[PDB]
Structures are given as C-alpha cells and as structure tokens.
C-alpha cells in the first residue's frame, strides 16, 4: 500500500474494484452427473463422500493414514499367558441400453445393389467381374455384406 499506484487508487474517486471470492472457493458444485449432484453432501469431503458412495476415490496407496474411525472395539492380545445404492443406480444407467439407430443404406447405392440383384441375381463371381455397375470394382464379400444388409432392409 506504499506504491504510488495503490495510494492514488486509494485517494481516487473511483473506488476499488472489489470482488469477494474466498467464501465460494471452498464450496464446489460437481457439475457433471445429476445423480452424484443429488448424493453430494458438501460436508463430508471428496474422500468421505466418495467412500459413502462406494466409488474408489484415489486409485492406489494413499500417503498418510486413513480414518479407521472406530467402527469396532479392538481388544488386547493375551499372548497365551499361563494358567452401493447410488452405485446400483449408476450401474443401471450404464446398464441401460441407449436408443440406438441401425446404420441404414444410401438410396443411390442401394439402388445400385438393386440393379446388381436383378442383373446377376445372387451369384458373386459373375458380378465381381462385371464392368458395368461395378465400376468401383467392389471387394468380393463387401458385395456380399452390402447385399445382405440390403436384403435384410428390403426384399428378404
């Protein structure tokens, strides 16, 4: 506060461009999945909240000590003295099949296949050595694949 700039900006009639950030940098929204956004708690931690989920937070070998957090009573050894839920929800969601579309055929090339289907029929060695309407000289079996896709699409 002893630079000439800071003193002038202090004495100026502008006022400081003041923005407060330090409160809101601790809290974060998770932004990504609404399911985790539901089960997120903003209180436990990244670590405790992932543990309460059931998802493995860090992959492997944390430095330091985890909270063993006193789940059980451990008794001394005598030395022989003398006498899941949200996991299930995401598992359903990933298990949920998406509404997929079959990759269809284009009208010109299925018409081309339709020309081949009437010109040669079904046999492939004749249509492979056909010049007219096989000018791209398609592969022996690519012909089969496209014709079987066309037949399953149309014409049995």
């Amino acid at each position: 506060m002893t630079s000439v700039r800071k003193r002038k900006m202090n004495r100026s009639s502008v006022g400081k461009a003041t923005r407060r950030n330090k409160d809101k940098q601790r809290k974060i929204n998770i932004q990504s999945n609404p399911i985790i956004a539901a089960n997120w708690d903003y209180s436990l931690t990244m670590a405790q909240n992932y543990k309460k989920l059931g998802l493995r937070a860090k992959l492997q070998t944390p430095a330091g000590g985890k909270e063993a957090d006193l789940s059980k009573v451990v008794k001394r050894i005598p030395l022989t003295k003398p006498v899941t839920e949200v996991v299930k929800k995401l598992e359903e969601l990933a298990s949920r099949p998406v509404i997929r579309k079959e990759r269809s055929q284009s009208e010109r090339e299925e018409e081309w296949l339709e020309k081949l289907y009437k010109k040669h029929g079904d046999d492939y060695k004749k249509m492979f050595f056909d010049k007219k309407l096989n000018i791209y000289q398609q592969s022996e079996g690519d012909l089969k694949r496209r014709l079987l896709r066309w037949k399953k699409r149309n014409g049995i």
Binding site: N29, S32, A57
Partner: protein
C-alpha cells in the same frame, strides 16, 4: 533465504485443487490406473513401486487397445519393457480387477 510460511496454506489450496479437479471428474478417480513395478538398484530391488504405464503388449494381453485404454483411465507407457514374468502377470491381474470394477456410460 526463503521460508515456507505457506506450508499450511498451499496444502489447503492443493486440497482445493483436489476438490475442484474432482468436481469436474465427478465419477472418475483423480489418478489413472498405474502399474505395479519392481524397482531397480540393488538397494531397492526387493521393493515394488508404482510405475508410470504398463505397455502395449500387456494391455493387449488384458484384451483391449491402449488408445481405448487411455479413455478408460489406464496409464500407458510405450518406452517401458516387460521383462519379468511375475510383474507382468500381477499387473495383468490388476488390469482385470480394474476392468471388473468399472461401469462405463455410453
């Protein structure tokens, strides 16, 4: 002369990073799937360690491609070489266990 007065502070900031990054990576872990790799240097040759990445051939032995495996969060090193049997097999079992526990969204 420098004193780490910010040692308490930076850790907080670092966990803020470990918070904030985690916010973007919300289901996924922060870290990738790293190999378990035995160390060099006879002082340390009994020690096993976290390695950088597995190999191409090992990920193929796991039954997937490394280009796809980077999307699954499996760290892959091409320039490493697999030369020990038990290292290879244990890391394959590690890959299989990682495959068992993931669920991938389409």
């Amino acid at each position: 002369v420098k004193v780490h007065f910010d040692q308490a502070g930076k850790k907080v900031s670092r966990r803020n990073a470990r918070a904030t990054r985690a916010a973007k990576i919300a289901p996924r872990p922060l870290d990738l799937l790293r190999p378990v790799v035995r160390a060099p240097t006879v002082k340390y040759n009994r020690k096993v360690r976290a390695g950088r990445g597995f190999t191409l051939a090992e990920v193929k032995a796991a039954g997937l491609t490394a280009a796809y495996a980077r999307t699954i969060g499996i760290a892959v090193d091409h320039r490493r070489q697999n030369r020990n049997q038990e290292i290879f097999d244990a890391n394959v079992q590690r890959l299989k266990e990682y495959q068992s526990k993931i669920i991938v969204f389409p």
